[PDB]
Ligand binder design. Structure first.
Ligand SMILES: O=C(Nc1cnccc1O[C@H]1CCNC1)c1csc(-c2c(F)cccc2F)n1
Length: 243
């Protein structure tokens, strides 16, 4: 059945499992097909967040199969943000604001469906380059959202907050916001702020000279060491740099 409705094209990336470009046979709609080995949570999380729309900041799930294979939308043309930055350098504050804005709303959306992505990072933001639009991908390591802390966590280390590194403490919202701060620093500076555990734990920020102080202040807020010092998502949207 899979091989009846869909044709796998080139490998696009191989942790998540593996993602391919493909087409849906009947109408040659372009899709991405994500293969996983060993029903997975990702399908459920994608369902919850897709259901009735749901959001333009989130890649839609279109179909899934056992043999596990997920059929995802594929904007044409598209590039993840990591590769974009590799090729083009930091986004610069005007387009970061817009993309950062979109990511935050996608995250808010997800939280509204009770889903925490838990792996926000630039490899996981797809830029749909026709519409000028960021989309969240890769829910393979997300969870259902709760007040209660986690240790279910298997994220990307360099986007993980100090209290996870130090205490194995994962609080969904503060850890999300921490990762947003990493991402934003990524976007405007062209690299992550902290490469090693020790750097995360110290959390010391040295901004390149080109980063505006407005952008600095927001990033410092998101990357506060103590998780309760961190803004909520609404505070971030209301930050003066975000206007
Ligand atoms: O779901 C996706 N991706 C993903 C999911 N789940 C886990 C990992 C995923 O991606 C990996 C490759 C790029 N970043 C991580 C996805 C949908 S469309 C797409 C995509 C594209 F349309 C053009 C170029 C590169 C692309 F990736 N990707």
């Amino acid at each position: 059945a899979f091989e009846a409705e869909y044709r796998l094209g080139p490998l696009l990336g191989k942790g998540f499992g593996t993602v391919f470009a493909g087409h849906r046979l009947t109408d040659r709609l372009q899709v991405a097909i994500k293969v996983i080995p060993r029903c997975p949570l990702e399908v459920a999380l994608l369902w919850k967040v897709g259901a009735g729309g749901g959001h333009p900041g989130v890649i839609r799930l279109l179909d899934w199969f056992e043999t596990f294979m997920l059929v995802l939308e594929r904007p044409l043309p598209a590039q993840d943000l990591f590769d974009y930055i590799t090729e083009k350098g930091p986004l610069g504050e005007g387009p970061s604001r817009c993309f950062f804005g979109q990511v935050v709303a996608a995250i808010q959306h997800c939280h509204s469906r009770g889903v925490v992505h838990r792996d926000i990072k630039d490899e996981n933001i797809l830029i749909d380059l026709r519409r000028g639009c960021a989309k969240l991908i890769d829910f393979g390591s997300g969870a259902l959202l709760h007040d209660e802390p986690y240790t279910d966590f298997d994220g990307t280390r360099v986007y993980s907050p100090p209290e996870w590194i130090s205490r194995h403490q994962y609080h969904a919202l503060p850890a999300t916001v921490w990762s947003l701060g990493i991402l934003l620093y990524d976007m405007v500076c062209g690299d992550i702020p902290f490469e090693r555990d020790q750097e995360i734990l110290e959390a010391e920020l040295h901004f390149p000279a080109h980063v505006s102080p407005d952008c600095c202040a927001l990033i410092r807020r998101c990357l506060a060491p103590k998780p309760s010092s961190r803004p909520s998502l609404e505070e971030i949207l209301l930050d003066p740099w975000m206007q």
